[PDB]
Amino acid sequence: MGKAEAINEIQKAVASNKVIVYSKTYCPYCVKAKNALNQFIAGKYTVVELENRADCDAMQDALLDITGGRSVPRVFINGKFLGGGDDTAAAASNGTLEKLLQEAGAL
Fold first, then answer.
1. CB 43: neighbour CB atoms within 10 A?
2. Gap between the terminal Cα atoms of the chain
3. Which residues contact 48 (CB under 8 A, 6 or more apart)?
4. For the chain, which domains are there?
C-alpha cells in the first residue's frame, strides 16, 4: 500500500466520482469545503477521511504529486482538482461552485 498504489487509487476515484474530497475528521478547512458543498449537494458526494488510513502519509504524498499540495482538504470535481477549503468556499460564494457542479452532472 505504498505511494504508487496511492496515486493509482486517488486517480481512479477522482475519475469515477463526480465530486470527491480527501479530508480528515479533525480539520477545520475540510469542514469549510464540506459546508460549501453542502449548500448544493449535501449528502451527495464522497469523502475519504485519512486520519485512520495506515497509508495516510502515502495518500497525502500522492495528493502532492497530483495537485501540487499535500494538505487536506483536496476537492475534485468532474475529474479536475478544484482546491482546498478556502478555494471551495470562495467558489461557493462567487457562484462558480454551483456551475461546476451543474457541468459535472452532480446538480
1. 6
2. 34
3. 13, 20, 21, 22, 23
4. 3-96 (3.40.30.10)
Q: Which three cell numbers stand for residue 27?
A: 480539520
Which letter does DSSP use for residue 103 in this model?
Answer: H
Distance in angstroms (rounded) separating the CA atoms of residues 53 and 58: 10
Give Cβ neighbours of residue 21 (< 8 Å, ≥ 6 apart). 30, 33, 34, 37, 45, 46, 47, 48, 73, 74, 75, 76
Amino acid identity, position 45: Y
Can you give the length of the chain in residues?
107
The three cell numbers locating residue 103: 457541468
Specified resolution (Å): 2.4
